[PDB]
Design a protein around this ligand. Structure first.
Ligand SMILES: [Mg+2]
Ligand SMILES: [Mg+2]
Ligand SMILES: [Mg+2]
Ligand SMILES: [Mg+2]
Ligand SMILES: [Mg+2]
Ligand SMILES: [Mg+2]
Ligand SMILES: [Mg+2]
Ligand SMILES: [Mg+2]
Ligand SMILES: [Mg+2]
Ligand SMILES: [Mg+2]
Ligand SMILES: [Mg+2]
Ligand SMILES: [Mg+2]
Ligand SMILES: [Mg+2]
Ligand SMILES: [Mg+2]
Ligand SMILES: [Mg+2]
Ligand SMILES: [Mg+2]
Ligand SMILES: [Mg+2]
Ligand SMILES: [Mg+2]
Ligand SMILES: [Mg+2]
Ligand SMILES: [Mg+2]
Ligand SMILES: [Mg+2]
Ligand SMILES: [Mg+2]
Ligand SMILES: [Mg+2]
Ligand SMILES: [Mg+2]
Ligand SMILES: [Mg+2]
Ligand SMILES: [Mg+2]
Ligand SMILES: [Mg+2]
Ligand SMILES: [Mg+2]
Ligand SMILES: [Mg+2]
Ligand SMILES: [Mg+2]
Ligand SMILES: [Zn+2]
Lengths: 207, 60, 50, 152
RNA sequence: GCAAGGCUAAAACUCAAAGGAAUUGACGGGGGCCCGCACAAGCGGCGGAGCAUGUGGAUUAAUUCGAUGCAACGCGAAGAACCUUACCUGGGUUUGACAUGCACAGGACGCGUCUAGAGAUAGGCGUUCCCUUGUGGCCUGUGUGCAGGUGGUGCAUGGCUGUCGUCAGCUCGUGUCGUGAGAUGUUGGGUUAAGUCCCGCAACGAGCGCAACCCUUGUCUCAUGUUGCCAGCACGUAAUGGUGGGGACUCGUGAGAGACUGCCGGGGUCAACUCGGAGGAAGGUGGGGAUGACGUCAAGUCAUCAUGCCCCUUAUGUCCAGGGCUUCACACAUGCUACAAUGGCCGGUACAAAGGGCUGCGAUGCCGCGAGGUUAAGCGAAUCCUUAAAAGCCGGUCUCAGUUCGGAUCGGGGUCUGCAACUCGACCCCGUGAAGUCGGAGUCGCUAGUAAUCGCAGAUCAGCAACGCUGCGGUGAAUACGUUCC
């Protein structure tokens, strides 16, 4: 409640937009369409581990790009689940949909995936102090990771008082603009409520 | 907001002057921008996430 | 307003820029207009023909 | 402030009368950014002074200022269970500033109609040593005199 | 023992501690050093009046809910006439306004008419497509799992935010000292805006913070020339760069240069660094913005959203019409307009920036005193409209008066938006012309393009914003001795 969003801070400097198009009059309903698309692709695909969704709209033609560590699940029974999802998107928009799953190289140095895995362990009742440490070690064993910070906050294991601990390895210069800091946020749905999990991954300054 | 109110707003009301805008994402009735159709909150989170092309923090 | 409730004095500004150029006056040669219409460009840039 | 003195700003000579005294006067009369109006008021006052006395207006103004400039002020201080006035010397530029402030402030509350003639009358009375501006300097000097005991 | 009293000296009962050293913090009307519109020096206000807005209280059928020292009170609300709306009265419905599972049946749906305040209900029509041949879509009706809840708990929570405070601190690894909590590093001497840096040292290194990278403003170079510019020619309509044209100037927008104590003098352990010069558009962080460490306040939010438990299910769900959220013996808070001559009114006239516009902006013309009405060129826009900036300058008048100040209140008549202007909209015209003559104790902001003052634009938006908010430009000051006091 005091730190700025790391992505928003550098948006337009280092990080880039996840939606690309130009629309003067058709801006509001493009936004309304994209939010519905994002609800759809967030529902049911949690097992698939979605990293980030990028949306491309090119003069009445929509190109949706999804990134995950396990494209086999999103495709399904060799092109059946993918076809069903594309049919859902077609029914949603009315415009012909081009759906693409590419790959996620390293779901160990990728925030919003590290965070999702940690939240999965919390939901499965693993000790948080162990899940956080294993995630941090897995991330620091990656090619280009100059540091990582992982923060969990909530009732943290059935406690009554909610608290917040965080661990840190390497260096994570949040205030620096020339940095390349990936951000990830996910919530674990434990039996006692929700638990927020935040991950900051620093991957060196710039190209 | 309540789903009954969200459906009522989405519908076509009697006396077209009665039509009002709600947030396209959360259903907030107040502080909804016409160009996005979002409330100020949902606008802020979407802009930080980068899901709104052309929008970015402003310094001058 | 940054907060979801009651903190009016804390705010945040956002822009939205639009860049405009290339009002060029190319000749309406039928073989040139061929290339003009068969070329397709990024969607992030909007192009209009007058 | 705490980190020593601050740089003061310089002024330029007045075109019609090549002095900075009348520039300080217009800056004392100026309100709400109406510098042209303040210049008009000051110029009219100087012209009325010239047309009533014959003498050069800036010379009359310098005489009035010499009459109303103080030498000792009475800055207040608290020591024990009582607070009492302490007479201190006045530096020259502060004396000129204070004299101009006194002239304009007392002319603003004279019983006449327009500020031009109010200020002209105040300047003439000060140059003659009669006005409330001179009375103020005399009262200041008397209070600085009646407290020489506390000259620590 | 003269006395005061001294000496020897219990118990009941009662408590689960009472204590000694030392550690980390916090605090002191302890000490040293340093800083901040903190004071001082100035300028302008608020507290007094009228009105706008929010709040307490009171009232009411309801005056929905939240915020409550700084850090609640022009706050959530960037727009309460219906709608919004979550509240009241009454009229309805109750697998529901909305999604799916399980069991039947076959049109759903749309159009129009009546009754009704409306919700809804009935008169009658278009129709069962898809092969309701079977699968399909859809729907009713019956139900049944349910859906729904702005119902509770912010002291169960996520997320988001304020605040101390843009204050300069907060820590870790190894090593060393101590039985231990811990300490050291992070202390000492200088220096800085800075835990900024240098010199020493049982510490050596590191991290988040500081600074820097980002945006904007300030100078120049190169590229560029339309819808932008107009120097040199023609053209000069009409002077409206209007036209041919030009690459000169500006400007527009791209890439660069430039500021680093870089150079010089003095100081300083020759170090950090400091004082003063040169050259430069700019000189020591050039001005401004974005950026909020570890944490604190069980700070704020279950009414953005999400959510664990609890609660309602012919109602605490849902639909509708009127009403309320706009009350008013009072109190507080933030503002606007004033109390006038540095002014009011009238006439003429000059100089901006930043933005908005197809369910839109309306140039021109005609009508109207005016708000406005009508026609309609152009314009998704450096080309059209918005577009007349106002203070300013010149002239005339008023002559110190509760006024030719002030513009509340009230009477009459209108315009527009909207199904609708009573409760409860803005604006215009005629009349009306209140308090108020500078404001007690007290209290607030501001150190330069600042304060003070003058207009313009946007968001929300049918209308309500020329008193709020977020911005833009115009004019443009006075002071700072200094750290005794708060
Ligand atoms: Mg409306
Ligand atoms: Mg002790
Ligand atoms: Mg102390
Ligand atoms: Mg003071
Ligand atoms: Mg006052
Ligand atoms: Mg008052
Ligand atoms: Mg209330
Ligand atoms: Mg306040
Ligand atoms: Mg305010
Ligand atoms: Mg209502
Ligand atoms: Mg709380
Ligand atoms: Mg410390
Ligand atoms: Mg220590
Ligand atoms: Mg440091
Ligand atoms: Mg910084
Ligand atoms: Mg609390
Ligand atoms: Mg509360
Ligand atoms: Mg909720
Ligand atoms: Mg609830
Ligand atoms: Mg109603
Ligand atoms: Mg209200
Ligand atoms: Mg008048
Ligand atoms: Mg006039
Ligand atoms: Mg007329
Ligand atoms: Mg009058
Ligand atoms: Mg009276
Ligand atoms: Mg008077
Ligand atoms: Mg007073
Ligand atoms: Mg409006
Ligand atoms: Mg106001
Ligand atoms: Zn929203």
């Amino acid at each position: 409640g005091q730190k700025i969003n790391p992505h928003g801070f550098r948006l337009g400097i280092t990080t880039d937009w996840k939606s690309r198009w130009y629309a003067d009059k058709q801006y509001a309903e493009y936004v309304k369409e994209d939010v519905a698309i994002r609800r759809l692709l967030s529902s049911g695909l949690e097992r698939a581990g979605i990293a980030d969704v990028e949306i491309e709209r090119t003069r009445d033609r929509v190109r949706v790009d999804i990134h995950t560590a396990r494209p086999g699940i999103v495709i399904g029974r060799r092109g059946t689940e993918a076809d069903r999802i594309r049919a859902d998107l077609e029914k949603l928009t009315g415009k012909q949909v081009q759906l693409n799953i590419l790959e996620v190289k390293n779901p160990e140095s990728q925030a919003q995936l590290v965070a999702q895995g940690v939240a999965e362990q919390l939901s499965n009742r693993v000790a948080f102090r162990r899940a956080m440490r294993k995630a941090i070690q897995s991330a620091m064993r990656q090619p280009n990771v100059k540091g990582i910070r992982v923060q969990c906050s909530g009732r943290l294991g059935g406690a009554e008082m909610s608290r917040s601990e965080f661990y840190r390895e390497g260096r994570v210069p949040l205030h620096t603009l020339r940095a390349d800091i990936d951000y990830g946020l996910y919530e674990a749905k434990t039996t006692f409520g929700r638990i927020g999990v935040k991950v900051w991954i620093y991957k060196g300054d710039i190209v | 907001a309540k789903k009954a109110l969200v459906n009522k707003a989405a519908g076509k009301p009697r006396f077209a002057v009665r039509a009002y805008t709600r947030c396209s994402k959360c259903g907030r009735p107040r502080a909804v921008y016409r160009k996005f159709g979002l409330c100020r909150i949902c606008l802020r989170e979407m802009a930080h996430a980068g899901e709104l092309p052309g929008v970015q923090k402003s310094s001058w | 307003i940054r907060s979801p409730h009651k903190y009016k004095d804390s705010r945040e500004h956002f822009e939205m820029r639009t860049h405009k150029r290339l009002i060029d006056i190319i000749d309406p040669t039928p073989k040139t207009v061929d290339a003009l219409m068969r070329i397709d460009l990024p969607a992030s840039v909007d192009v209009n023909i007058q | 402030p705490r980190k020593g003195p601050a740089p003061k700003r310089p002024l330029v000579n007045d075109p019609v009368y090549g002095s900075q005294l009348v520039t300080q006067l217009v800056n004392k009369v100026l309100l709400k950014g109406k510098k042209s109006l303040a210049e008009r008021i000051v110029y009219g006052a100087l012209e009325q002074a010239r047309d009533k006395t014959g003498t050069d207006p800036v010379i009359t103004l310098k005489r009035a200022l010499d009459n109303v400039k103080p030498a000792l002020e009475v800055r207040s201080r608290r020591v024990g269970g009582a607070t009492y006035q302490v007479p201190v010397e006045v530096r020259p530029d502060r004396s000129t500033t204070l004299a101009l402030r006194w002239l304009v402030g007392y002319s603003r509350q004279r019983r006449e109609k327009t500020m031009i003639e109010r200020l002209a009358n105040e300047i003439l009375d000060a140059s003659n040593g009669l006005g409330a501006s001179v009375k103020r300097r005399e009262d200041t000097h008397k209070m600085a005199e009646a407290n020489r005991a506390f000259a620590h």
